[PDB]
Design an enzyme around this catalytic site. Structure first.
Site, PDB file in Angstrom:
ATOM      1  N   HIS B  37     -61.511  34.196 -35.710  1.00 57.93           N
ATOM      2  CA  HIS B  37     -60.536  33.372 -36.414  1.00 57.93           C
ATOM      3  C   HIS B  37     -60.547  31.933 -35.936  1.00 57.93           C
ATOM      4  CE1 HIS B  37     -57.432  34.143 -33.147  1.00 57.93           C
ATOM      5  NE2 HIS B  37     -57.051  32.949 -33.516  1.00 57.93           N
ATOM      6  N   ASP B  84     -62.436  40.649 -34.463  1.00 56.60           N
ATOM      7  CA  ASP B  84     -62.142  39.243 -34.203  1.00 56.60           C
ATOM      8  C   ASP B  84     -63.046  38.693 -33.088  1.00 56.60           C
ATOM      9  OD1 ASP B  84     -61.056  36.728 -34.473  1.00 56.60           O
ATOM     10  OD2 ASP B  84     -59.082  37.263 -33.651  1.00 56.60           O
ATOM     11  N   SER B 173     -56.381  31.655 -28.048  1.00 58.22           N
ATOM     12  CA  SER B 173     -57.238  32.474 -28.883  1.00 58.22           C
ATOM     13  C   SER B 173     -58.698  32.168 -28.554  1.00 58.22           C
ATOM     14  CB  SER B 173     -57.073  32.212 -30.361  1.00 58.22           C
ATOM     15  OG  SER B 173     -55.820  32.797 -30.777  1.00 58.22           O
TER      16      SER B 173
END
Ligand SMILES: [Ca+2]
Ligand SMILES: [Ca+2]
Ligand code: NA
Ligand code: NA
Lengths: 224, 224
Positions: B37, B84, B173
């Protein structure tokens, strides 16, 4: 978009969805104007997919085109810090009407329209169907009073409500904020940039002030 | 990182900052492992800057290297929707020890370490200096029960606390979640992926379950 409703197919044909989870507008049929914070920097880049032509991202009528290069606003550092614009060159044009951008301050007032496939609530999922909302202008002075994070007045235009639950949100970034010009055509005055939460009481949305950057955007577009 | 403390210079040499505002791990000296992402897709990309070698992103000793290519996990849809992971090939190597990834489930338990330059509280600014925290493994059953979004058990590993204010947050992230293996060397078990808020009561952090993807990650790396 919080407090939004569906755009009609064909209503805002300049809208594009970008595969990092942002919106954009067709500045040219093969150039998307989006937010600087939606891209990583400037360079060649064939990894972004632009989805055009449709409000429903699952439609088989969608046009999906890869990027070829990105130009992120020179000097960009972070949203609350200004210059939140970028261009994405597409490998092929999307055969849809383009959105003219504001080159003067004439339209930096009134009631704006926003659109995107971002969340419908803070923390929510992205949307399948393009949503739209209207948001009124908020002056730099009123926005700075409301804000925690720096406002660069020349570079940022605010819009939204005090308590009404209607705002852009996560994943709307990069989409256009627009209104009618004096010739009854849409003109882009903002780029969805940042906000403290989404639709928070006493907080507004902050948008890139496109008229400040229109000359630089045209110079950048000439490089692509 | 919420509840973090500053990582010492040299403590985690494999940490990388990426210019879209994500973390990453030095998977090979010229390949960063990050979250899907955090990238747009797969293709050529010279627009990402990786900052290696330093806890202080403003350090005069920072190693700043541009990307050449990105490979996003095939079939990635959505953080809450799994797979992811992504690889970023660099034009120049970062001469630091790399972080070995887990290929078995042997280490998918115990107390993990997380690190990043993300926010230290919900809605906070990114950090100049690398922060670290420890978070314990949370079973998929406990995690699922807690979650408002889809938990794909085989693809997601949860970690963190019911109420203690220690978690990853926005901008962490793509960084690694790691611990020691039987040889007392660091091994990567997770990629910072998503969470509901940051350190919210009753909510955990959700990480890409690297052991599930290790074979696919190596095969992707072999093609870069
Ligand atoms: Ca302004
Ligand atoms: Ca699991
Ligand atoms: Na408000
Ligand atoms: Na918690």
């Amino acid at each position: 978009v919080v407090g939004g409703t569906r755009a009609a197919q064909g209503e805002f044909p300049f809208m594009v969805r970008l595969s990092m989870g942002c919106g954009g507008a067709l500045y040219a049929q093969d150039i998307v104007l989006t937010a600087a914070h939606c891209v990583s920097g400037s360079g060649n880049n064939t990894s972004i997919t632009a989805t055009g032509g449709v409000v429903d991202l699952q439609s088989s009528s969608a046009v999906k085109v890869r990027s070829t290069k990105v130009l992120q606003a020179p000097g960009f550092t972070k949203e609350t810090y200004g210059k939140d614009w970028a261009l994405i060159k597409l490998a092929q044009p999307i055969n849809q009407p383009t959105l003219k951008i504001a080159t003067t301050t004439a339209y930096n007032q009134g009631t704006f329209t926003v659109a995107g496939w971002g969340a419908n609530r803070e923390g929510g999922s992205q949307q399948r169907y393009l949503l739209k909302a209207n948001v009124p202008f908020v002056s730099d002075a009123a926005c700075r009073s409301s804000s925690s994070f720096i406002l660069v007045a020349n570079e940022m235009i605010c819009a939204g409500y005090d308590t009404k639950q209607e705002d852009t949100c996560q994943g709307d970034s990069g989409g256009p904020m627009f209104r009618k010009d004096n010739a009854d055509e849409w003109v882009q005055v903002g780029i969805v940039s940042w906000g403290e939460g989404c639709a928070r009481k006493g907080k507004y949305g902050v948008y890139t002030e496109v008229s400040t950057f229109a000359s630089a955007i045209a110079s950048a577009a000439r490089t692509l």
